[PDB]
Recover the amino acids of this structure.
């Protein structure tokens, strides 16, 4: 059992993370790649492997990047939306260096 | 990054791992004991020989 033991007392997940994990109730059916069902989402990783994520701002940013990544012109078209999406997460875009 | 099926399993906060796994095993303990089979006395849990 991996998932059921995340909200344990000895675990070092953030208390807000633990509360959010308790609050969300997942699905019993399969989740298509890039989509979200029942507060749960499935998106690709850095190398393209699929990941299971909770539907939060970071997951939305990751799904948007998966939508965008693979074409420089695609990044350029919706740059500001991507900037805002990262700014919503915990790994935000640096300033205009 | 949790699993989609077992997130619904998480219900309360800060439950120790020992109690969680003990309840996990006690579910099957009660399920088997419902059949009316008494246990046998064993020295330890391995019992390899
Ligand atoms: C947050 C998280 C991290 C995991 N990391 C690994 C890992 O590094 N290597 C591995 O083989 N399995 C990893 N697993 C999968 C576990 O070995 C196990 O299959 C999974 O936790 C069971 O999920 P379940 O509670 O939905 O049944 C991970 C699972 C989760 C939820």
């Amino acid at each position: 059992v991996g998932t059921a033991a995340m909200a344990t007392k000895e675990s070092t997940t953030s208390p807000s993370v633990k509360r959010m994990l308790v609050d969300t109730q997942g699905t019993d059916q399969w989740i298509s790649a890039g989509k979200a069902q029942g507060g749960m989402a499935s998106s690709r990783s850095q190398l393209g492997a699929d990941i299971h994520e909770i539907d939060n701002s970071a997951s939305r940013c990751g799904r948007l990047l998966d939508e965008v990544a693979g074409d420089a012109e695609a990044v350029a078209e919706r740059r500001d939306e991507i900037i805002a999406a990262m700014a919503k997460t915990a790994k935000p875009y640096f300033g205009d260096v | 990054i949790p699993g989609t099926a077992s997130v619904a399993g998480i219900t309360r906060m800060d439950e120790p791992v020992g109690e969680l796994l003990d309840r996990f095993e006690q579910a099957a303990i009660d399920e088997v004991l419902g059949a009316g089979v008494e246990p046998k006395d064993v020295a330890s849990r391995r019992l390899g020989r």
Notes: Strands of chain A lie at 36-37, 40-44, 50-54. Residues A 1-4; B 1-3, 5-6 surround flavin mononucleotide (CB under 6 Å). The CA atoms of residues 18 and 66 of chain A lie 27 Å apart.
